[model samples]
Target: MSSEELEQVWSNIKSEARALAECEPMLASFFHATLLKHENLGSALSYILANKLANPIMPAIAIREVVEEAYRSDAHMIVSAARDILAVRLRDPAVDKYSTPLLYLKGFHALQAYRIGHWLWAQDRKALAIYLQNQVSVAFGVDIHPAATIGCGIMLDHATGIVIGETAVVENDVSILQSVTLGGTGKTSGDRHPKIREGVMIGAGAKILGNIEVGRGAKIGAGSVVLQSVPAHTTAAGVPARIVGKPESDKPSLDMDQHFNG
Candidate 1:
């Protein structure tokens, strides 16, 4: 989306926050701190995420510096943030307002922290990156390595227990549910994680292991253990999952379908 488009989204979010503040007087200060105080999405996100990830070990002010610096150095993070918020609003039935994810969603918080961690990792500040990763896991129950490559427009539903290994690559528009693991088969070294392509929908508790590919638009059924590559637009199910059938829709992530024939 264009910069103008992103501005429109921010405008909508601010408008909604104003109404919410009036209805829930208790959250007025919270909304002001998160929404009304910032000039743009990048500043608001850095402040909110830094506060969420901060601890006794690392101060919120320091984390805010890291996040803000990342946003300043790279415009992609801001664009990705907007896309992610838009993705959740469009795909998740629970998200009625854009401010929902911005203020209350732990998944969105974790993802933004990971973005900062990823920036730190790329800049060779591995220790700080690892610290951010550990903080995210503790705060959100979502463990994604700082080095994992994640694309934009991703939705991590119920994000708790979601794990992505260091070498894992998740492409654009993928929607993964809680407890989904893109991990290594066993004790392995470099490049040992799954590659989830664009528009793949991984159901709850499904584990895709090793350096395998889940092709674009495929669906992995709930609780399945996948040990091999799944072809594009196919549906994989069962423990040690096999190709059950093709997806009913071309973009299974958008459809959010989990059912299949026996």
Candidate 2:
């Protein structure tokens, strides 16, 4: 159950919390009980998610057990979470501490909630998973369907107006900025929405639809309307979606460029 990767993450959070407590001191009470007290990320995460996601019918004490077991159910889930932490550290310019997102960031909270939501769905509790998924919507303002599986390295900054349908599949290392829609072209069913392959960036206020797929390392310029499939390492922009240019690196999302130069 215990490994070096998770162990390393815990120590990083511990080190960061301890350093902050030394300088600030009031954080000593906060970190000592909630953070340092917990042996690993799973325990600490259970406390945070359970205490907040708890409601009238499903209280924290009972639900906490479910959250704890979810972590143990899949060995890779925690490591995926670690990739998310790695995601924020490398991509986020505003990040200052390792434990900040674990405690505060709404975007981070949304991602973890999705993980739990995914877990709940796979555990054969579709009804309960939907309930908790809505809790995530109410709490974090991000709606990711449990049916949809998004790989790691997603940054939902400000984190609202994210409309991910049940059929859409988002690959890893992709960033979806505010007001992005991965909706179906029509009110139809069964694999109609767009699929963002790995290393793609869906910019703010863009609407992409249909059974289209944006290939790897592609960039959807902010406020653009993408109605067609974009090619690999390409840039699609404008209302009807045109081939603008190619990205400097393989992953356009890692660039974090929110503007349209062309």
Candidate 3:
């Protein structure tokens, strides 16, 4: 995103929060402190991540300091973040207000937390990174390995029960629902687990296993158990999943269409 794009995104978040705060007096403090009080999206995001994952051993301040370092290390982290929040607003109809995801979406929170841990992993701080990953899993019910590679503009819809294993790669602009597992099969070792390409839509409760690739612009239907590579722009449905038909749209993730035409 360009300079003003991120600025506008954060501004809208504050505007939405202030409007909600005025409407619901009880949550006014929540809105004011979380969104309005912060100087930028980075500050607000760091505060939220730390506050949510804080525990007796790892306090809010400690976690916040670490998160700030991650943000500082890569300025693109903020860009990725802005892109993420905008992605949610663009995709989900339930998110009428821009501030809703920032305030209440555990999926958004979990992903940001993972971003910090992934940064830590890159610095060879494996112990600390794994510890942070554990905190995120317990707090948000979503387990994504620190070593896994996931890109920006992605949405983990209803993120609970979402497990992304080690060595898995999820590219940009993909949308995955809750209860989805991208895991290894049998006694696989290195380079195991599925690779999710760009602009794919993976439905709820889908289990995509092994070192398979779900091609770009493909659609994985709900409750399917996949074991092979799904072709680009195809729809894979049913148990032991196979190509059912072409997707309704070239990029089903953007549309979130779950139906198939016979």
Candidate 4:
């Protein structure tokens, strides 16, 4: 990225930050929470820019909608999560540099569906929310609870077999892969879902159970099972995932399929 481009990027982020701050104080708070929670602003900023550059339309739409949803749901958590998402993008090393707007939304669209369902859920329209949720499942092969809270610029790559629990809380700009599960550990209700920090890339077929928290910019490797807390800026692999190394540095490609089977 050139200096001019970098300036433009910062301008957008600053504009967005300020705009959200004025239009929606909750998102501003979320932004502050994320900044305080994580130490990798570059990763978060990079991911947000990548998403904006890639899926200009949906992300733009989703950002506004996510702000509304955050206010409707848990304003503080969602706002904080949104900031965390940007932070993750700035920090994570596994994002695909070759990604384009046309290719970025394969999984992004699914998240939009989740947003819609979440909206419907807020209206207490369970039927519509469930129906939209099913559409998301058929189209993206990802199952997220209609009540789950997700942030903007999220890229769910190859999004098959991803499951998000009802109480799950996934922060912004998180990159999730196929076959990842964010299901509950048992039958407990109320916040029984996973809290995935920003900039985290969940590998294919990874099953993350319980109400555990995956710290900022953490990378959960392929086919791993996460059963505990993953600290910020680290890598975790294998069943019952444990800390491995530094953050995984790989960018996700946007050239995936684009068929939503709703």
Candidate 5:
């Protein structure tokens, strides 16, 4: 299933890369370095992430190997990568081309880096995993704990200042915007974060704290503060959020609507 998906996504990327190279002759080498030279999406992703996350402390080549090993061990990463790209292309009106997310989007780049960091955490490489997380935060301004469990088809639009806690669980097809926090209330430990269910849309500057659940297909309005569980297919809003209304669609994430009425 994933092999076919990966192939199709790679084909789209190849087509875009070819066209982009011809149109912007100056960026031909840049495209080759990031996309054209790679045999697959995983390889290209690994190179791009390593280049971005690399610093004076950890070199690009070293980070590349770590990301490559994660991809080799887990085929799910590639599948999720393709889904994330598709999610951006479909949900974001600004994304006119398939290559936009792959080549330029920081949100996509940050999420893919988190996948590698998460893989390292699962492998019990705790220190390295934390290091990757720190670097990702530094480079992308998005802080998702490596221990957090996130699903595919996820979109983190304008991902800057987004923070997911260590035990936070974000399900498939969830859409989150800038400055959102799926975090703990305080010093509490163990399973202390929000669980964002599938197809939910979390607006910019919203804060969902503690171990509560944001039910599937719910929509959270921008700048809302969610402190409790919300029912499925509902819309929550305000400083301390309340169920204001119901979402028009089952999958509000796909709709990408942020407005709510009182």
Candidate 6:
């Protein structure tokens, strides 16, 4: 976006934040923190807000910062480049569910249900919550820990076989693919989860282990096993993910059928 457009977007977010503050003080406070810490938090959040407005699904708490970060970073180009990717991911032929949002329209709806389950898990409703999580896994093929902290506008394309660990921290506008795993390295105890920064594109069949940081706009190539920190605007691929080059808009494709028809 140009400077003038960015300014206008930020202005709108400021106004919206002020309006929301009157009703939801706590959420407003958190949004403020999100904006302060993340440079483009406002724009990142605006993206999610726009999508939600354009295609209403379940009622979700909006974090008006993630999309802003993605927009302000180099990852913006990849996101725009992959606009048709969601359609490809959602074009399954076997499932009976109707056509929906390009990438994870149905998966997002499933997550809406999991939010309730997470709430139940928080309220000491263990058995029911676990049951709900299992149901979500069975129905959506995405397994996000109830305790995981996932930011706004997280697009999980071909959502099947995705495992987000208990202490995982996934930031805004992250595009993760199918068969990807964010897991622990060993028998570590404290904070044994990966911290994925905003606008990171996790390639298909990738495995990110330990509590490492994958920097903003970092791209993990398909089938890479990440065990260390990845800097911003870089691409990491291979058995042990190593920085190959800067992230580019050309995404890798396969011949398999779409995963989200049901």
The models' CA-based lDDT, in order, is: 0.89, 0.80, 0.89, 0.59, 0.90, 0.57
lDDT of 6 by residue, 115-152 (tens): 44455566676675566566567656777777776664
Candidate 1: tens digits of C-alpha lDDT, residues 219-256: 99999999999999999999889999988999898988
- Clash statistics: count for each candidate: 0, 0, 0, 26, 0, 12
Q: Taking the tens digit of each residue's C-alpha lDDT, what string does model 5 give over 1-262?
A: 3577779889889889989999999999998888988888888888888888889889999889888888889978988989999999999998987788888888899999889889989899989889888888988899999999999899998899999999999999999999999989778679879999999999999999999999999999999999989998999999899999999888999999878878
Model 3 clashes, total count: 0
TM-score of each: 0.98, 0.92, 0.97, 0.58, 0.98, 0.55
Off by more than 4 A, model 3 = 186-188
Better candidate by TM-score, 3 or 5: 5
Which structure among the candidates has the greatest lDDT? 5
Local error of candidate 2 at residue 28 (angstroms) = 3.4
Candidate 1: regions farther than 4 A off: none
Error of 4 at 110 (Å): 1.2
Q: Write the per-residue lDDT of candidate 4 for residues 31-111, one digit (tens) a residue.
A: 544322333333332234233323433354444444355445643433333433343344334442221211243454466
